[PDB]
Amino acid sequence: YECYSDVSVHEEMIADRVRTDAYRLGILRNWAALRGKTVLDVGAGTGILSIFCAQAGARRVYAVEASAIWQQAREVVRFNGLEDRVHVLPGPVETVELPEQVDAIVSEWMGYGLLHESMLSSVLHARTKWLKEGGLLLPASAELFIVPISDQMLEWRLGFWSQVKQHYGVDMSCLEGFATRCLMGHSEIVVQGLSGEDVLARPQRFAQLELSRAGLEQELEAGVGGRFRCSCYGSAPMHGFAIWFQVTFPGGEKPLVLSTSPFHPATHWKQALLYLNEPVQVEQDTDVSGEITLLPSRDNPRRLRVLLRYKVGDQEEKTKDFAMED
Amino acid sequence: YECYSDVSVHEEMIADRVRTDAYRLGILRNWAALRGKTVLDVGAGTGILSIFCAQAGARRVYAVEASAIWQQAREVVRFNGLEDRVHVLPGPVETVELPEQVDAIVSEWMGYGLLHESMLSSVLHARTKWLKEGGLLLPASAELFIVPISDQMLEWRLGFWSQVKQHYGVDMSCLEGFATRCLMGHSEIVVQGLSGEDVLARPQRFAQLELSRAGLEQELEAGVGGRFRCSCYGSAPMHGFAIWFQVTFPGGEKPLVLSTSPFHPATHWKQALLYLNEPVQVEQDTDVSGEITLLPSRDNPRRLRVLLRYKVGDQEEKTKDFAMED
Ligand SMILES: Nc1ncnc2c1ncn2[C@@H]1O[C@H](CSCC[C@H](N)C(=O)O)[C@@H](O)[C@H]1O
Ligand SMILES: Nc1ncnc2c1ncn2[C@@H]1O[C@H](CSCC[C@H](N)C(=O)O)[C@@H](O)[C@H]1O
DSSP, X not given: OOOHHXXXXXXXXXXXXXXXXXXXXXXXXXXXHHXXXXXXXXXXXXXXXXXXXXXXXXXXXXXXXXXXXXXXXXXXXXXXXXXXXXXXXXXXXXXOOOSSOEEEEEOOOOBTTBTTTXXXXXXXXXXXXXXXXXEEEESOEEEEEEEEEOOHHHHHHHHGGGTHHHHHSOOOGGGHHHHHHHHHSSOEEEEEOOOGGGBOSOXXXXXXXXXXXXXXXXXXXXXXXXXXXXXXXXXXXXXXXXXXXXXXXXXXXXXXXXXXXXXXXXXXXXXXXXXXXXXXXXXXXXXXXXXXXXXXXXXXXXXXXXXXXXXXTTSOOEEEEEEEOO | OOOHHHHHHHHHHHHOHHHHHHHHHHXXXXXXXXXXXXXXXXXXXXXXHHHHHHHTTOSEEEXXXXXXXXXXXXXXXXXXXXXXXXXXXXXXXXXXXXXXXXXXXXXXXOBTTBTTTOSHHHHHHHHHHHEEEEEEEESOEEEEEEEEEOOHHHHHHHHGGGTHHHHHSOOOGGGHHHHHXXXXXSOEEEEEOXXXXXXXXXXXXXXXXXXXXXTHHHHHHXXXXXXXXXXXXXXXXXXXXXXXXXXXXXXXXXXXXXXXXTTSOOOTTOEEEEEEEEEEEEOTTOEEEEEEEEEEXXXXXXXXXXXXXXXXXXXXOEEEEEEEOO
């Protein structure tokens, strides 16, 4: 059967060493709590996290996987001789039947912008249904950050048309307006990796999601987020905002943090970019504030929508609402 | 209006210096034939080729463009003060009405694998309808090449699963079979850029398309191509074949060749790859032969289909038919 996408998606995740080592170490550092205990792996994929749990000493791991990759998970487990310790089960976690409640849930559920097409609702469903009172959740929480940015690659693309004269003796500088409207004037969230120098101010946490928190499902439906305020470092053309997340694994010891910040090593999640309609020049101490909400799209409840109200310096407040890139 | 794709596509073409300089110089080297003459630019895009023709001395250029980018073409021409020499006209070349027959047609019509979603039929329609007897076609011809290849990036992806043990202490080598079926076992043409070291034998020309040739439209409908034979250079895991094209501009003087070969500087066309179902080991002097045809797909006449019958060394003849990547 056709499976190009199957392999590519899992290759990308497992090739993401930042992600995979964070889970590797985040699970292993909890060995004392996992040794001789049971684990549910929500969305086991190739089974890698389930085998990490077994390495950490778990007696039984339930590796639940909804798509066809479950077949590969079964094979990886059998091949590593762990079929008596890791039970790969097909189908959605919402309807899986387990022989027992579990001591722990592990899951990599995070989407682009944390919440775009994420498995969070499934993890919470599984927590409610299958996790023992006082059970371990790995990771245990997630936090969302926002900061104003100047995107060097975007700047290059905006400038491209004025470079045509130098290359080919045809003046196309008149197309800057066009490029700006097309590249910035849309209402789509753009997934792109930034570096530290693109960041124009101190990043601000705008949401914290404690996965054990009661009523988190209802919060996610209504929208998560809040206000933010920061001050710019120097002269720059601000292009908009970047948002990203981190998730935290409890330690034995200090917690382990898997971060997708532009200051930290790159991951496959990159960051989620929210472009203004056009650049705005900022200076040292330019105040930038706003209010942001992440919520389900109307027409597709799995698709991320962002509501943003913002103010840059002395410019009037502006609204720009986004929906995730196709 | 939403125009992200508009700008990106044209940015990519104009940013492709190999392509754009080839047209720049290919047109300019024909200055003696263009000076004081008329040109039809089929699919003018941003108008760049039309302005090249004006620089070459054309009295009048008809810049015909079917999509919304015509608006930008109009602006570029007005901005360069050439509205009296370059006439940007909206809509498909098939229904454009010109005041006169033209002395020359210029067009960049080539698709991936030369013929995937190409404008060749439109160029030939325009040639028949609008070009004067003995008129100049730029470029004048196209040639197609095939060679057996070993794709280093594919090899890396095939090997990936056996590297997991080293990174994360989980053995996933058992997934090689899976990766191979998924990455090679499909029937899609893959667009990817190769280097000279991926090429396993002397490339063979398998088709030549003379754009003035009578009945070329009927050839394209029936399928273009032919047999080929070559001999491998050394020990390698052969993954399949790469195909590519060149187009030729007559000189004043020697012709100018725009090539998309893996031995030549990279272009946005890259090459079109035809993977075997699994790798085959070849050695010095391993004979590789076959027959290849490029033709319209059944369900979408603009989509490229490739019929391939091939024989590697002592292995029996095999058929594998492909259709272009979604
Ligand atoms: N409701 C659900 N129940 C079970 N599996 C699900 C699910 N929703 C998504 N999935 C699966 O969850 C996986 C998430 S990707 C993470 C895979 C693996 N745990 C790893 O870390 O490498 C995908 O394979 C997807 O098919
Ligand atoms: N039948 C047709 N008539 C007119 N324009 C067409 C056409 N089919 C495709 N096009 C246009 O032809 C262009 C080809 S891309 C090449 C654009 C430009 N000449 C350059 O070299 O940079 C696209 O803009 C496409 O919209």
